[PDB]
Amino acid sequence: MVSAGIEAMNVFGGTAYLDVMELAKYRRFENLLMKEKAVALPYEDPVTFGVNAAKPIIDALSEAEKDRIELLITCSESGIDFGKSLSTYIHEYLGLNRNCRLFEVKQACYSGTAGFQMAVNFILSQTSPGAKALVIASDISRFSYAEPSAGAGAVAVLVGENPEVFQIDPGANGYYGYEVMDTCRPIPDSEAGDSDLSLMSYLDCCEQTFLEYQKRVPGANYQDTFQYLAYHTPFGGMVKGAHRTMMRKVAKVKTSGIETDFLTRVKPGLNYCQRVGNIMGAALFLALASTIDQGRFDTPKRIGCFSYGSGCCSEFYSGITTPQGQERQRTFGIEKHLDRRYQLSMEEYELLFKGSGMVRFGTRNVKLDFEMIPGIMQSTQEKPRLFLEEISEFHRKYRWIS
Amino acid sequence: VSAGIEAMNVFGGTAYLDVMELAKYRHLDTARFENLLMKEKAVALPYEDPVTFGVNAAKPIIDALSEAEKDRIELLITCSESGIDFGKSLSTYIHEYLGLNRNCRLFEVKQACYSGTAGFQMAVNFILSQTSPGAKALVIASDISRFWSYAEPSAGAGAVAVLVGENPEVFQIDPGANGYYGYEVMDTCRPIPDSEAGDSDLSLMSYLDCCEQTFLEYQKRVPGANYQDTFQYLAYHTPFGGMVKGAHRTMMRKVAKVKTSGIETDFLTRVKPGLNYCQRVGNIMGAALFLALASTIDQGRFDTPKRIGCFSYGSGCCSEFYSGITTPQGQERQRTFGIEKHLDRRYQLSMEEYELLFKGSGMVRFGTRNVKLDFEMIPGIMQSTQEKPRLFLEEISEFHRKYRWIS
């Protein structure tokens, strides 16, 4: 009847980043498909990241197409308020039409997929024919073995009725959730709990989501049905591990062919995760976007996506991306934008770390210095970017910088 | 395919106090209270939280379902601004203690008091999408107020659970009949763990702006819609009855453009029913509109199917106006939950008991890592009423919450 999914998607992978191994030295042989991690500056927040992710999408839309954006869901665990959604600020600085539902969803790293699935149902519901939605997953890590791994990033996803970049397979969904005692975020500016069960639950969910998908999609098969696979990816290493486990557990193939399957179906999805680090609720979208830019779509290919969030909830779902989709995605130049970011030295990193306190969950009044790390602003010369200028009686003021 | 509320129930606290009594005991200007239609406010005990409230709201709904119907619950959204964690959703704990099937999406939505409606509208679209035919969803709006001065007597605690599905006798929504409107505004927000801040200076102006613009958007999509004749009752986000009375008046002048003399009558026949339960509970934030909807259905007249119009607002802000039909059968279903009876059975705090509670509310405070709760800290309350089993917070251990059923 009516199709639904991603019409466009873009990644904002920070203004600044550091070299993961360098930071380990300055602080052995883990070395686990990490290379770079993005780092939120103090004049940056989840609004900044979300707006900067979504701006290139909105820029490319006509005035009429933009006014059809009628749902803006931001997905995060880096909330700035217990009641005010990040979506309010984002709605303002992207200049969206007021005829728009806006809110924030939260379930650890499942947030993005939850937001996306609700957006998809808005489209399929046809409660507003021709409408679009914008789902923005945005997370940052402020502040031992988590520090070099923990990133900052956002992925914006425009959803609608002509989804050349990722047309979902309606109803082809295996969702699974249950309460588990796991690493959570019970304190304002930090984490707590235990990643001791994390992997076990991720793998449990990974299996059970696919089995639920098979139950609703008869004939589905983990090896042949999917030409690429994308996973919630905190770091490449554990996804490589989880893929291996899936091929033994579920696909039940011989050990010798697994490395090949990983390289052809999963490695493309992992490219951008190495440039940015764990971006939590945006990690799966990042991997999806990596998959689409780094893979091959001479003809339409099916991609299977697994989403997981601690606590926990999870979902496995799938969609088609076409040659035209991949073309659209290339115009955003994600890789080029990653190449242009500013590399912190360890000394600069220390100035940032000691400065991150001035913007800390309770902060009522603060004025930010964009020159606090002198080189960064006037360093690249690109499209305008949003930054946090000040907090005044808890209300946030943002500024465009060219 | 139809969609909407198949059942709905309210949990209005274990304990409550008399609002005027609390104003006196705090030595406040009684005048600033006198026309606001407030009587009682519910108060979360320290052994209660948004999970407790949510679970207790939803339990009777789940009890009334067959095993098979319950296993079709595939979406659990909880709607709050009283979150307990930056990433772990209240839905995880609620999913556990209601015993739902693991084949279920779960998460939390947040936009001030719009949270509930946002959750409910996403749930409706799950049903209309037919991505899982026969599936149901459960949307639970749950908020509590822990502890500026003039908010204390007004600020309540409560939850409303809403089962959404394909045979909605209690509120069948009108698909696409939706006027949503939002924009950024500097308003009263919740930027600190256990409190509020900002300014209710623009709040009313924005609530009224939104109330008008949502209906105009609704008209734009529903040609022929009319604020007076189309809706046999109207429900609003209601923090307290007084401002909804005011906002209805304003709407009848601004939008319906009727003569001043007939407005009081229109308020009494179309709005006053919806305000009954709010007086018993106080402002329950994201659940307030659902509370008023439930009040409307229990207290109104549905000899024949009536259309109800609902206005949802949340500071910051976002808002939506939408409508549905409720049938005589719907109102019957709703009566089986005995909401009024449950409100009658709550424990009334004295001011001395209220002080013990207030000084105790600190031990359960957003950052709390380890605590053991005393259910006898206010001696009379537990073994007071004799009702179905109820969930309470027993302990927090390394940030993980443990809950207990008490018969």
Based on the domain organization, do A288 and A306 belong to the same domain? yes
Question: What is d(CA A18, CA A373) in angstroms, rounded to the nearest whole number?
Answer: 14
What is the domain extent for residue A31? Answer: 1-170+323-402
Interface test with B, best of A76, A86, A107 (most B CBs within 10 A): A107
Q: Is B79 noted as a catalytic residue in this protein?
A: no
Q: What is the chain A residue with the closest CA to B97?
A: A179
| A207 contacts in chain B (CB < 8 Å) | none
- Cross-chain residue pair A188–B183, CB shorter than 8 Å: no
Question: What is d(CA A216, CA A172) in angstroms, rounded to the nearest whole number?
Answer: 7
Which of B141, B182, B179, B145 lies closest to B57 in space, CA to CA? B141
From the number of C-beta atoms within 10 Å of its C-beta (0-12, 13-18, 19+), residue A239 rates as buried
* Structural contact between residues B131 and B124, judged by C-beta atoms closer than 8 angstroms: no
Based on the domain organization, do A211 and A293 belong to the same domain? yes
- Domain stops at, among B327, B353, B381: B327
Q: What does B110-141 look like in DSSP terms, one character per residue?
A: EBTBTHHHHHHHHHHHHHHHTSSTT-EEEEEE
- Neighbouring C-beta atoms of residue A206, cutoff 10 Å: 24
**DSSP β-bridge partners for residue B404:** B392
- Cross-chain residue pair A110–B110, CB shorter than 8 Å: no
Based on the domain organization, do B153 and B182 belong to the same domain? no
* Structural contact between residues A75 and A276, judged by C-beta atoms closer than 8 angstroms: no
What positions of A carry a catalytic annotation? 77, 109, 232
| Helix (H/G/I), strand (E/B), else coil: B287 | helix
| B178 contacts in chain A (CB < 8 Å) | 127-128
Does an H or E element contain B296, and which? helix B288-299
CA distance B365 to chain A (A): 11
A280 sits in the region (left: phi over 0; alpha: psi -120 to 50; else beta) called left
* Structural contact between residues A356 and A141, judged by C-beta atoms closer than 8 angstroms: no
Based on the domain organization, do B120 and B193 belong to the same domain? no
Q: Is B400 noted as a catalytic residue in this protein?
A: no
Question: What is d(CA B293, CA B301) in angstroms, rounded to the nearest whole number?
Answer: 13
Interface test with B, best of A68, A125, A232, A392 (most B CBs within 10 A): A125
Strands A166-177 and A5-12: antiparallel
Show the tokens assigned to A220. 């589905």
Integer CA distances (angstroms), A87 to A107, A326, B20, B97, B316, in order: 16, 28, 38, 31, 10
Based on the domain organization, do A155 and A185 belong to the same domain? no
Show the tokens assigned to A138. 């945005």
Integer CA distances (angstroms), B215 to A103, A247, B169, B176, B204, in order: 20, 54, 24, 13, 17
Show the tokens assigned to B72. 């079709």
Which of B38, B53, B58, B48 lies closest to B280 in space, CA to CA? B38
**Cis omega (within 30 of 0) for bond into A312:** yes
Q: Convert chain A into a string of H (helix), E (strand) and C (coil).
A: CCCCEEEEEEEECCCEEEEHHHHHHHCCCCCCCCCEEEECCCCCCHHHHHHHHHHHHHHCCCHHHHHCEEEEEEECCCCCCCCCCHHHHHHHHCCCCCCCEEEEEEECECHHHHHHHHHHHHHHHCCCCCCEEEEEEEECCCCCCCCCCECCEEEEEEEECCCCCEEEEEEEEEEEECCCCCCEEEECCEEECCCCCHHHHHHHHHHHHHHHHHHHCCCCCCCCCCCEEEECCCCHHHHHHHHHHHHHHHHCCCHHHHHHHHHHHCHHHHCCHHHHCECHHHHHHHHHHHHHHHCCCCCCEEEEEEEEECCCEEEEEEEEECHHHHHHHHCCCHHHHHHCCEECCHHHHHHHHHHHHHCCCCCCCEECCCCCCCCCHHHCCCCCEEEEEEEECCEEEEEEEC
**DSSP β-bridge partners for residue A12:** A154
| B130 contacts in chain A (CB < 8 Å) | 124, 171
| Helix (H/G/I), strand (E/B), else coil: B300 | coil
Integer CA distances (angstroms), A133 to A65, A72, A99, B36, in order: 11, 6, 12, 39
Integer CA distances (angstroms), A139 to A276, B22, B325, in order: 12, 42, 41
Q: Which is catalytic among the residues B113, B210, B310, B318?
A: B113
* Structural contact between residues B177 and B218, judged by C-beta atoms closer than 8 angstroms: yes
Q: Which phi and psi (to 5°) does residue A352 adopt?
A: -70, -50
| B85 contacts in chain A (CB < 8 Å) | 184-186
Based on the domain organization, do A164 and A293 belong to the same domain? no
- Cross-chain residue pair B183–A121, CB shorter than 8 Å: no
* Structural contact between residues B42 and B12, judged by C-beta atoms closer than 8 angstroms: yes
- Neighbouring C-beta atoms of residue B280, cutoff 10 Å: 24
CA distance B27 to chain A (A): 28
* Structural contact between residues A89 and B185, judged by C-beta atoms closer than 8 angstroms: no
Place of tokens 């007084």: B242
CA distance A105 to chain B (A): 5
- Cross-chain residue pair B192–A92, CB shorter than 8 Å: no
Based on the domain organization, do B167 and B90 belong to the same domain? yes
Give me Rg for the CA atoms of chain A: 20
* Structural contact between residues A204 and A249, judged by C-beta atoms closer than 8 angstroms: no
**Closest CB to B183 among A91, A309, A395:** A91
- Residue A263 neighbours by CB under 8 Å, 6+ apart: none
Give me Rg for the CA atoms of chain B: 20
CA distance B149 to chain A (A): 19
Based on the domain organization, do B226 and B271 belong to the same domain? yes
**Closest CB to A81 among B107, B181, B190:** B190
CA distance B269 to chain A (A): 31
Which of A264, A281, A282, A263 lies closest to A272 in space, CA to CA? A282
Q: What is the chain B residue with the closest CA to A106?
A: B108
Q: Which phi and psi (to 5°) does residue B153 adopt?
A: -70, -25
Angle at alpha carbon of residue B276, lines to B275 and B277, rounded to 5°: 100
Question: What is d(CA B66, CA B78) in angstroms, rounded to the nearest whole number?
Answer: 22
- Domain stops at, among B259, B293, B327: B327
Q: What's the domain count of chain B?
A: 2
CA distance B384 to chain A (A): 32
Show the tokens assigned to A10. 């873009």
Own/partner long-range contacts of B348-352 (Cβ < 8 Å, ≥24 apart): B348/B15, B348/B16, B348/B17, B348/B18, B349/B15, B349/B16, B349/B17, B349/B43, B349/B378, B351/B17, B351/B21, B351/B22, B351/B25
| A310 contacts in chain B (CB < 8 Å) | 87-88
Question: What is d(CA A316, CA A162) in angstroms, rounded to the nearest whole number?
Answer: 22
| A201 contacts in chain B (CB < 8 Å) | none
CATH classification of the domain holding B347: 3.40.47.10
- Cross-chain residue pair B315–A99, CB shorter than 8 Å: no
| Helix (H/G/I), strand (E/B), else coil: B216 | helix
| B107 contacts in chain A (CB < 8 Å) | 105-107, 110-111, 114, 313
Question: What is d(CA A57, CA A6) in angstroms, rounded to the nearest whole number?
Answer: 12
Question: What is d(CA A111, CA A13) in angstroms, rounded to the nearest whole number?
Answer: 18
- Cross-chain residue pair A103–B96, CB shorter than 8 Å: no
Based on the domain organization, do A338 and A279 belong to the same domain? no
Integer CA distances (angstroms), B310 to A202, B227, B320, in order: 41, 11, 8
Q: Which phi and psi (to 5°) does residue A39 adopt?
A: -135, 120
- Residue B327 neighbours by CB under 8 Å, 6+ apart: B169, B170, B172, B302, B305
Question: What is d(CA B346, CA B6) in angstroms, rounded to the nearest whole number?
Answer: 26
Question: What is d(CA A321, CA A291) in angstroms, rounded to the nearest whole number?
Answer: 10
What residue type is assigned to position B246 of the chain?
Answer: G
- Cross-chain residue pair B122–A121, CB shorter than 8 Å: yes
| Helix (H/G/I), strand (E/B), else coil: B30 | helix
Integer CA distances (angstroms), B264 to B36, B204, B245, B259, B272, in order: 16, 20, 9, 11, 10
Question: What is d(CA A346, CA A338) in angstroms, rounded to the nearest whole number?
Answer: 20
Angle at alpha carbon of residue A171, lines to A169 and A172, rounded to 5°: 60
Q: Which phi and psi (to 5°) does residue B239 adopt?
A: -70, -45
Interface test with B, best of A71, A84, A197, A201 (most B CBs within 10 A): A84
Question: What is d(CA A200, CA A195) in angstroms, rounded to the nearest whole number?
Answer: 9
**Closest CB to A101 among B84, B130, B180:** B180
- Neighbouring C-beta atoms of residue B344, cutoff 10 Å: 9
Based on the domain organization, do B183 and B305 belong to the same domain? yes
Question: What is d(CA A342, CA A274) in angstroms, rounded to the nearest whole number?
Answer: 16
- Neighbouring C-beta atoms of residue B104, cutoff 10 Å: 22
Based on the domain organization, do A194 and A271 belong to the same domain? yes
Based on the domain organization, do B342 and B399 belong to the same domain? yes
Count contacts between A and B (CB, < 8 Å).
236
- Neighbouring C-beta atoms of residue A111, cutoff 10 Å: 31
Strands A69-75 and A132-139: parallel
- Neighbouring C-beta atoms of residue B220, cutoff 10 Å: 11
Show the tokens assigned to B307. 């259309």
Question: What is d(CA B66, CA A217) in angstroms, rounded to the nearest whole number?
Answer: 26
- Cross-chain residue pair B129–A120, CB shorter than 8 Å: yes
Question: What is d(CA B53, CA B146) in angstroms, rounded to the nearest whole number?
Answer: 14
Question: What is d(CA A187, CA A191) in angstroms, rounded to the nearest whole number?
Answer: 7
Strands B306-314 and B233-236: parallel
Place of tokens 């018969």: B407
**Closest CB to A114 among B82, B105, B398:** B105
**Closest CB to A181 among B179, B186, B400:** B400
Question: What is d(CA A341, CA A335) in angstroms, rounded to the nearest whole number?
Answer: 11
Q: How far is CA B32 from the centre of its chain?
A: 25
Place of tokens 């969904």: A173
Question: What is d(CA B321, CA B73) in angstroms, rounded to the nearest whole number?
Answer: 26
Angle between helices A323-330 and A283-294 (to 10 degrees): 110
* Structural contact between residues A105 and A73, judged by C-beta atoms closer than 8 angstroms: yes
Q: How far apart are the first and last CA of chain B?
A: 40
- Domain stops at, among B327, B350, B368: B327
DSSP 8-state class, residue B299: H
| A82 contacts in chain B (CB < 8 Å) | 81-83, 110, 190-191, 193
Cα four-point dihedral sign A137, A140, A144, A148: positive
Q: What is the largest CA-CA distance in chain B?
A: 61
